[PDB]
Design a protein around this ligand. Sequence first.
Ligand SMILES: O=C1C[C@@H](c2ccc(O)cc2)Oc2ccccc21
Ligand SMILES: [Zn+2]
Lengths: 161, 47
Amino acid sequence: GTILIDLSPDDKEFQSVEEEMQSTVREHRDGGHAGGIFNRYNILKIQKVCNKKLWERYTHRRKEVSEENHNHANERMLFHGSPFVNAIIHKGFDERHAYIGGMFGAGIYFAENSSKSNQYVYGIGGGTGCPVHKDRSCYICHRQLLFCRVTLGKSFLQFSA
Amino acid sequence: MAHSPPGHHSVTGRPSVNGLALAEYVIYRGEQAYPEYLITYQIMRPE
Ligand SMILES: O=C1C[C@@H](c2ccc(O)cc2)Oc2ccccc21
Ligand SMILES: [Zn+2]
């Protein structure tokens, strides 16, 4: 029961999402290996994802966490890059989207840097790049990211390299 | 899928070395995120 509503590039909601996307690009220590070499994006489209069931499921869990954390869900908007975005928007996140060999263990990973989530769009380490040209740095093929509402609650703080 | 540390609902990877890197986060329950915006794009070849 998912529908996608196109945002107009004239809408301020389109604009604030574009801005969070563009302004969170950074350089990566792999020199562009996984995600390619770019300082910015050409945004082609931004769609709002509407699914009643998946939303009620999210808000039910958010209240539980909130009640366990002095009424503070500690909700963020973060980026997720994945080969399975089409499954995610129709059936929601589950253990099939977990990053088993992730630095912080087998869970679902999100980034503040849009450019970080971009490195996973074609798979872990960028996989073999775009399906059409096998190019991790393809400037032609269309990519897709998700900008997601994430409930962090009480977050365990892990300093890392 | 693993579990949260006991007493925690997620992990924050705070990059300590690279000063320019922002944070990364991990949840252990699918129901703790909702995919609100689907963004379609190309990366751009720099000048
Ligand atoms: O945005 C992502 C997605 C992601 C990921 C996606 C699918 C998968 O199978 C494994 C990892 O990993 C990450 C790791 C760190 C920060 C962001 C991400
Ligand atoms: Zn391509």
